Design a protein around this ligand. Structure first.
Ligand SMILES: CCCCCC(=O)OC[C@H](COP(=O)(O)OC[C@H](N)C(=O)O)OC(=O)CCCCC
Ligand SMILES: CCCCCC(=O)OC[C@H](COP(=O)(O)OC[C@H](N)C(=O)O)OC(=O)CCCCC
Ligand SMILES: [Ca+2]
Ligand SMILES: [Ca+2]
Ligand SMILES: [Ca+2]
Ligand SMILES: [Ca+2]
Ligand SMILES: [Ca+2]
Ligand SMILES: [Ca+2]
Ligand SMILES: [Ca+2]
Ligand SMILES: [Ca+2]
Ligand SMILES: [Ca+2]
Ligand SMILES: [Ca+2]
Length: 1688
């Protein structure tokens, strides 16, 4: 059907439109203007409009008649998510009003904000609504509503209006917003909700203790759709509920909602209903357009949110349960199905039970399959502190949850491991050759028919993404065209070979839905389109630069083919548990590690492969200052029926040890078996359970390897501290006190992380082969400690020792700790001993130990009949993967430089250094002081890094190199600048030894990039010796390597010219003005300093404006270092502080080749805008700009002379830009110099500079009108006036404000005398006057008047089209057009303009210009000046200068920081007094409304409907006529009553006189009166001129009885018939009762008088009926003709 197709097309349109960022706050402004209703229902109505957007409701004032004119603009300022805003509904609703009753509904249109967002420009324009009644919907239309509504986001602008004389004001089907094919259709979504599983405990569990712990939740589903909330039934005490309820969602098709929000709630009787979790159906993702309606399911949707552990206290992460944030734990899953049923709109049973045959259908989507998951933990590095022991728990869904103690021991977690210092900064878990192994078994639906397709399309997209990265690197590197064509042919053949992939056959699979068939059909269509376009492109196209736009479109289409809403597999969540508490999480999608039998590509990207994931703290959007751990893990997921295929993915030998414990005790100096009381001699690890050596047997698939052996060597075998060559030791020191007492040395005055006392620093000695770097130890300052290096903690019972520390001392603290460091360069009888049995045994006996024990362990090896797959058959054993050999590597990181770093000191700079970390190794770069753009120029070498696994597995997945940038501070702790994560270039042999390429990787702090760092790395597999490694880089300091020659950017000699023009807006520094500044420009280690300004207040510009330095700069434009600008204020006692700095990193713009009817102003304005025309008299126009003059792209922002860079000072807070303390005005020209001085230098680029002295300027600000201001009063209007600040002078106009309009017509010139450039900042503000209260600011704009003065485009005065010396268009510039042509010839280096002997030709710019080339086809009226100036001006108009313009300047405000608060049509002329006085100013004073008189006479009435009963008691009518103009309610007049009419006929011969003010140029009238009696100032209305004539039954002693009306718009008055018998209905338009026809119209203002018969009407049951006929003559006279022939 066409309805299903158009729903699919509209949902794909909203699919393409919904692509912006999901910022939960975002500032939006929605304007809704109603203009004019046409043909509203009822008779003698008093209509009114109420518009409801986002809860806010505005209200029009009361108008009259069946064709009301409102022209009222409403504003809606909301702050919400864009996706939530575009699901909101705008509800326009027309009411009738009464004098003694409330409002009655008469029409309603509903339209969502999303579709008016999808319109180009985010704003529908003067479109007509089809009003309909929600309960009287069978009657069709009720009226029409011309509205225009706008949506403005951050940076968005409304589109300009267009001319409306004949296209928009008439006929309404020419501008319908929606066509008639919609036919008020409803769309019904049957969101069936079957059941849910694994809902966590959300009740108190104390009631069941008194009286079952698995089912402590009372769930129900909240379905939010289009603002309506439908709640399902509540299932009491069931964690696996079964609702089985269809939710009958409904939307009328003009207003659709896209985001169905399902939110399971735990119902609480006494408290608020808690949130279980929130998932969404996106209707645009489950619908397409051939196409199909929204279909989904039956498929489980997984919920995510807070951790599942119940706390009676408020949990800190309930914001994750509401769908905000990504969610850190599995909260259950809900089985839903979506079906779309067009029409049939059933209002009964919004909740309907599931029919009993759908419960048989849904059984086949509920079948479970066994899944086996393995995870081999390779390396857990970048740990910030050791703390307690650290454990990793793997869980998919609720399977493998360690805190679910009600189940059996799951063995889904690693052993507790204690972190080891890597020698420089970080910590790592010491796994080495024995990686931990986690295995767990889950049960999910076999949805491989989805996930093979998802994984294969993802592999397609990743291959094509790699190929387009190769292509963009090829075209960026300027590699030769043959290799580029070969690489492009490789790309196209990759597409051809890939997209002949047949998607998996849905027939035969159990869990195939209707949506699965539709997505498979869509994917086959898309893949066939991509394959055939590839076979077209491989033979047709020849150029790759045209085709990358199509190839990126293929990448976009392929990445939209991987969208799978029916992914029922929950994510694998890996939790780091420090101590007993959850710390950090990561979510791996289950399809990324899932194994399929269909091949490699159908398996996941990381299926059986080691991937690097960074854990996050549970409510962080990204990593902040502290990454908790960087974890490399080898995850393989798959079906347990094919778990034998894990053998091909496994590496190493999996190993589980059976264990036994034997205990002994010491009496009389001899160890023996005596005294083993309370714990068994042969027992477990705790000693409570008696065990034997014969109690352990291998399970199925396992066999013994070797014999039982003693295992005491696990202390020595943990990596032997041999992987480092430069180290830093650490020894901790402790003190203790009572609360409130004095400090003293502790019971354990030196400790380590294990929890007991350690050796003093005087006892520490080096290992053999090592020596000390420093002579003595020192205490740590660079942590969260005080001045002496101490942190403080507390002991709380029942714990005896502290577990946390803070930076400051409080009175309740009982302990303290200090770290001591020093750099470094270059017994075992088989038992562990302790003081008690079952105590803390340690490998060496102390004086207090009288007990001992040992381990008796035997190895199990997997059998050959099972392979490594036997680890899944362990249904506790602890599995660990042993690697039989190690591979030695060698990493070199070329940290070259950084740019645009954050300022984190008070002296406006930083001291950045970098921690380079890679696995269990770390090193620190040098500290570069007092800069934000450091050049470390340093190579960081980690020789002999031990990486386990095959070298190919390192090649496919390199471990990440992580750089953390820190601002060094001499006191306090060093602050975090950002973090860059990148992959090294792995090399395994001498073939792949190509040199690495430096790249600008981003430096992410939080969620934003806070600079870029130029860094690369290479990771070389070390051979038999270090001979295969390249040579060491040359040192410049001891153990300080430079970046080598092949990696370093190749530098050339390059000039940088700096046009230091001047400094603007210099804010005070240290409560002193910037009196003697200077400029310092640093680039590439060289600096240049300008001359010192002796007084900034006197001279704001540098005395010599050109600086010059020779710098070595990279040849490649990518590698170009930033340009640093500082401002140094020179003060007393020789002090030179820095008072401002900017970083300019985009220098590609700076590189250049050095060898390269009444006549006034408003008639002109209305002729240019388009609102006896003015162009017929031959006069000129002006150029109306819809934006600012700086925002016009042709004038380059009016910064062609010099750009402007904001200067910043001090430490920046919340990672944004720092405080702006001014602006440096200048520009740069960068060009490569010749290498040797025999070649002459290139010419300088700054020669034609103007004079930098201050100049006095006469500035004329002509402000024309304001457009759509923000309302600042209670009535929705504003009383605007103009407040101009220009340096010191303020001209406010509060006594000449314009009363109560949102579209003011100012028409006022404000002339000032200011000194440029000290007063360059021209601030024009519109302010709302108030009678008693404070004045609000509507808006604000800034014009750089020096940019107007100094630009080459002549923006100081716009050149008009004609040179007139008199009239209203007199030449307002100071200089004649010959002098402007002289000036532009002098600027451009052209020869000066040569005037001929008669002024007909001018030689300029190498061309001949003549008078007859421009003066032809024009009327040369009398105001034209000298013809040589006309021809010079005609030359000047073609030179790209600023024309005579009215720019539209956006009024910005702090109410909404980048949303237009209105617009201000205006222009500014700057007239510098050195060039002479200007001409006469333009009189832009708005024209008065010229008076008009409307006169009618009423001849007769015929076939009027007779009144049914008069007062006298007869079928008898008292016919008489009222008449008025809308707006003029006070000017109502009525005729005499034609008494005793028994035939519907009546003669009046009565005269009406209707004075009204008119604007012929705007084609509308002015009526002025107060809104009410207590109005401060009278208001003005702008409504089109029209006449309401009305016919009435008198009833002199009774009520007035309405009979009919007739409306004649005086510009479009319909042509009357010449007789009452030819007069009939439907010669006037009608759009509701019958299929419409065009009428015949004539203007009464032009055709001044005509006489005839007119039809008048009323309506009943929505259909027009004739109330009668009336004869009249309508005439319009002006003011003087009303006095020439007056009338009564
Ligand atoms: C006798 C029992 C009266 C119980 C009265 C009562 O209504 O208590 C409500 C609270 C919290 O109960 P909720 O299920 O809302 O917790 C949900 C949770 N905040 C969440 O957000 O997940 O109970 C307790 O703190 C336990 C007190 C036990 C006192 C013995
Ligand atoms: C009794 C009025 C108390 C004042 C509150 C009020 O509603 O004033 C109405 C008007 C204009 O509105 P405000 O700008 O004050 O409030 C709008 C608000 N600032 C905003 O930004 O939305 O204020 C007057 O001085 C005229 C008083 C006429 C009294 C006859
Ligand atoms: Ca509860
Ligand atoms: Ca409950
Ligand atoms: Ca509650
Ligand atoms: Ca600092
Ligand atoms: Ca510092
Ligand atoms: Ca106000
Ligand atoms: Ca006001
Ligand atoms: Ca106010
Ligand atoms: Ca009557
Ligand atoms: Ca009557």
């Amino acid at each position: 059907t066409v309805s299903e197709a158009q729903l699919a097309r509209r949902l794909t349109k909203v699919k393409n439109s919904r692509r912006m960022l999901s910022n939960k706050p975002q500032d939006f402004q929605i304007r809704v203007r109603v203009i004019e209703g046409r043909q509203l229902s009822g008779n003698n109505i008093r209509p009114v409009v109420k518009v409801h957007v986002c809860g806010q409701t505005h209200r029009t004032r009361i108008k009259r008649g069946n064709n009301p004119f409102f022209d009222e603009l409403f504003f809606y300022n909301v702050n919400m998510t864009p996706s939530e805003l575009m699901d909101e509904i705008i509800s326009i609703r027309v009411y009738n009003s009464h004098s003694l009753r409330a409002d009655c509904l008469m029409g309603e249109f509903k339209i969502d904000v999303g579709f008016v967002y999808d319109e180009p420009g985010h704003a529908v324009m003067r479109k007509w609504l089809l009003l309909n009644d929600p309960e009287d919907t069978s009657s069709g239309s009720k009226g029409y509503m011309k509205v225009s509504m706008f949506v403005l986001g951050t940076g968005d602008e409304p589109p300009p209006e267009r001319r409306d004389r004949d296209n928009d004001s008439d006929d309404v089907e020419s501008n319908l917003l929606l066509p008639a094919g919609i036919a008020l259709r409803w769309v019904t979504f049957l969101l069936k909700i079957y059941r849910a599983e694994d809902i966590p405990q959300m009740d108190d569990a104390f009631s069941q203790t008194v009286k079952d712990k698995k089912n402590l939740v009372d769930p129900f589903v909240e379905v939010s759709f289009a603002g309506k909330k439908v709640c399902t039934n509540i299932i009491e005490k069931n964690a696996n509920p079964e609702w089985n309820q269809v939710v009958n969602l409904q939307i009328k098709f003009p207003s659709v909602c896209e985001k169905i929000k399902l939110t399971i709630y735990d119902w609480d009787r006494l408290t608020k209903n808690d949130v279980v979790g929130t998932t969404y159906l996106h209707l645009s993702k489950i619908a397409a357009s051939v196409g199909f309606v929204p279909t989904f399911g039956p498929c489980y949707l997984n919920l995510y949110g807070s951790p599942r552990e119940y706390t009676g206290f408020p949990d800190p992460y309930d914001e994750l349960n509401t769908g905000k944030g990504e969610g850190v734990a599995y909260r259950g899953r809900i089985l839903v199905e979506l079906a779309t049923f067009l029409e049939k709109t059933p209002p009964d049973k919004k909740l309907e039970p599931i029919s009993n045959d759908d419960l048989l259908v849904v059984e086949k989507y509920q079948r479970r399959r066994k899944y086996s998951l393995s995870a081999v933990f390779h390396s857990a590095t970048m740990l910030q502190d050791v703390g307690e022991a650290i454990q990793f728990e793997v869980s998919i869904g609720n399977y493998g949850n360690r805190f679910d103690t009600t189940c059996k021991p799951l063995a889904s977690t690693t052993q507790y491991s204690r972190a080891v210092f890597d020698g420089n900064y970080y910590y790592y878990l010491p796994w080495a050759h024995t990686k931990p192994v986690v295995t767990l078994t889950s049960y999910w639906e076999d949805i491989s028919h989805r996930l093979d397709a998802v994984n294969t399309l993802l592999a397609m997209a990743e291959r094509l993404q790699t190929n387009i990265e190769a292509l963009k690197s090829g075209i960026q590197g300027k590699i030769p065209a043959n290799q580029l064509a070969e690489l492009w042919l490789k790309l196209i053949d990759e597409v051809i070979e890939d997209t002949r992939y047949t998607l998996p056959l849905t027939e035969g699979k159990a869990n195939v839905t209707v949506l699965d068939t539709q997505i498979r059909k869509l994917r086959s269509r898309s893949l066939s389109q991509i394959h055939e376009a590839a076979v077209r492109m491989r033979s047709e196209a020849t150029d790759v630069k045209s085709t990358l736009a199509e190839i990126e479109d293929w990448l976009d289409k392929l990445m939209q083919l991987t969208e799978e809403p029916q992914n029922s597999m929950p994510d694998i969540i890996i939790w780091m548990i420090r101590g007993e508490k959850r710390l950090a999480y990561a979510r791996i999608p289950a399809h990324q590690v899932l194994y399929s039998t269909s091949g490699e590509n159908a398996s996941g990207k990381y299926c059986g492969k080691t991937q690097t994931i960074f854990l996050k703290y549970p409510q962080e959007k990204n990593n902040g200052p502290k990454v908790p751990v960087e974890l490399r893990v080898n995850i393989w997921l798959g079906l347990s029926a094919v778990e034998k295929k894990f053998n091909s993915f496994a590496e190493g030998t999996f190993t589980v040890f059976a264990e036994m414990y034997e205990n002994q005790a010491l009496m009389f100096g001899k160890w023996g078996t005596s005294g083993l009381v309370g714990r068994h001699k042969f027992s477990d690890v705790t000693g409570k359970i008696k065990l034997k050596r014969e109690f352990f047997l291998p399970p199925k698939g396992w066999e013994w390897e070797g014999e039982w052996i003693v295992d005491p060597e696990r202390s020595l075998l943990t990596e032997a501290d041999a992987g480092h060559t430069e180290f830093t030791d650490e020894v901790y020191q402790n003190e203790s006190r009572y609360p409130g007492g004095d400090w003293k040395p502790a019971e354990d005055t030196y400790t380590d992380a294990n929890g007991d006392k350690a050796a003093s620093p005087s006892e520490l000695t080096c290992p053999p082969g090592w020596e000390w770097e420093d002579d003595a130890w020192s205490y740590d300052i660079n942590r969260a400690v005080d001045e002496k290096g101490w942190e403080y903690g507390i002991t709380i019972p029942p714990d005896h020792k502290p577990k946390s520390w803070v930076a400051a001392e409080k009175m309740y603290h009982t302990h303290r700790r200090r770290r001591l460091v020093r750099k470094r360069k270059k017994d075992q009888e088989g038992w562990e001993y302790a003081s008690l049995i079952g105590w803390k045994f340690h490998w060496k006996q102390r004086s207090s130990d009288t007990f001992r024990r040992r381990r008796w362990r035997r190895k199990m090896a997997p059998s050959e009949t099972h392979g490594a797959a036997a680890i899944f058959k362990l249904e506790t054993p602890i599995v660990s993967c042993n690697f039989d050999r190690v591979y030695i590597y060698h990493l070199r990181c070329y940290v070259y430089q950084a740019r645009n770093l954050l300022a984190l000191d008070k002296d406006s700079f930083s001291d950045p250094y970098a921690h380079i970390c890679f696995l269990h190794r770390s090193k620190t770069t040098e500290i570069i002081h007092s800069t934000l753009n450091p050049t470390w120029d340093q190579t960081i070498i980690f020789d002999e890094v031990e990486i386990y696994g095959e070298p190919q597995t390192v090649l496919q997945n390199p471990p990440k190199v992580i750089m953390e940038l820190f601002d060094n501070d001499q006191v306090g702790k060093d602050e975090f600048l950002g973090r860059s994560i990148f992959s090294p270039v792995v090399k395994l042999n001498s073939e792949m030894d190509i040199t690495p390429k430096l790249l600008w990787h981003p430096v992410m702090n939080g969620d934003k990039a806070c600079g870029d760092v130029l860094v690369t790395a290479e990771l070389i597999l070390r051979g038999k010796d270090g001979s295969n490694l390249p040579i060491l880089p040359p040192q410049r300091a001891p153990n300080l390597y430079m970046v080598p020659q092949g990696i370093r950017p190749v530098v050339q000699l390059t000039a940088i010219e700096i046009l230091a023009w001047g400094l603007r807006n210099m804010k005070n520094f240290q409560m002193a003005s910037i009196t003697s500044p200077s400029l310092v420009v640093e680039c590439g280690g060289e600096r240049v300093e300008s001359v010192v300004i002796k007084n900034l207040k006197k001279t704001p510009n540098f005395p010599s404006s050109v600086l010059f330095m020779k710098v070595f700069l990279p040849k490649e434009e990518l590698y170009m270092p930033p340009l640093v600008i500082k401002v140094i204020d020179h003060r007393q006692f020789g002090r030179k502080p820095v008072v401002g700095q900017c970083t300019i990193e985009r220098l590609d713009r700076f590189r250049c080749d050095p060898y390269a009817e009444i006549v006034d102003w408003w008639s002109k304005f209305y002729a240019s805008s388009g609102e006896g025309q003015y162009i017929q008299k031959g006069y000129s126009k002006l150029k109306i700009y819809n934006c600012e003059l700086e925002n016009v792209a042709e004038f380059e922002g009016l910064t062609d002379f010099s750009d402007t860079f904001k200067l910043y000072r001090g430490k920046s807070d919340e990672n944004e830009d720092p405080s702006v303390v001014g602006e440096f005005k200048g520009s740069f020209r960068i060009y490569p110099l010749p290498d040797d001085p025999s070649v002459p230098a290139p010419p300088r680029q700054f020669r034609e500079l103007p004079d930098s002295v201050p100049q006095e300027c006469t500035v004329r600000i002509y402000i024309v009108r304001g457009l759509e201001l923000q309302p600042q009063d209670n009535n929705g209007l504003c009383d605007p006036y103009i407040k101009i600040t220009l340096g010191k002078k303020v001209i406010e106009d509060r006594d000449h404000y314009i009363p109560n309009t949102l579209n003011p017509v100012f028409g006022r010139m404000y002339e000032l005398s200011c000194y440029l450039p000290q007063e360059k900042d021209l601030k024009i503000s519109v302010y709302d006057y108030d009678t008693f209260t404070r004045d609000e600011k509507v808006g604000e704009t800034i014009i750089d008047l020096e940019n107007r003065f100094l630009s080459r485009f002549g923006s100081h005065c716009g050149i008009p089209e004609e040179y007139c010396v008199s009239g209203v268009n007199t030449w307002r510039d100071q200089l004649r057009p010959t002098q402007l042509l002289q000036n532009v010839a002098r600027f451009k280096g052209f020869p000066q303009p040569i005037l001929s002997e008669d002024g007909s030709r001018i030689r300029y710019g190498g061309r001949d210009y003549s008078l007859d080339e421009f003066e032809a086809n024009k009327i040369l009226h009398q105001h034209l000046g000298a013809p040589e100036e006309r021809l010079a001006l005609h030359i000047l108009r073609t030179q790209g200068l600023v024309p005579e313009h009215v720019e539209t300047r956006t009024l910005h405000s702090t109410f909404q920081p980048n949303i237009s608060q209105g617009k201000l049509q205006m222009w500014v002329d700057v007239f510098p007094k050195s060039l002479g006085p200007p001409g006469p100013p333009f009189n832009i004073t708005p024209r008065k409304a010229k008076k008009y008189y409307l006169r009618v006479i009423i001849w007769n009435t015929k076939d009027v409907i007779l009144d049914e009963k008069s007062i006298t008691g007869e079928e008898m009518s008292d016919i008489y006529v009222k008449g008025w103009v809308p707006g003029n309610e006070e000017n109502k007049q009525k005729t005499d009553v034609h008494y005793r009419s028994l035939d519907g006929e009546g003669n009046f011969n009565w005269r009406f006189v209707f004075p009204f003010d008119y604007l012929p140029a705007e084609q509308l009238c002015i009526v002025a009166k107060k809104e009410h009696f207590w109005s401060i100032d009278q208001t003005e209305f702008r409504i089109p001129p029209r006449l309401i004539i009305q016919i009435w039954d008198n009833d002199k002693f009774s009520l007035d009885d309405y009979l009919g009306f007739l409306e004649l718009d005086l510009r479009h008055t319909i042509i009357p018939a010449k007789s009452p018998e030819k007069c009939r209905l439907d010669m006037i338009p009608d759009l509701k009762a019958m299929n419409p026809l065009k009428a015949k119209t004539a203007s009464l203002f032009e055709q001044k008088s005509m006489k005839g018969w007119w039809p008048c009407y009323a309506e009943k049951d929505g259909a027009r009926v004739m109330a009668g006929k009336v004869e009249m003559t309508l005439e319009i006279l002006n003011e003087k003709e009303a006095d020439e022939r007056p009338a009564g």
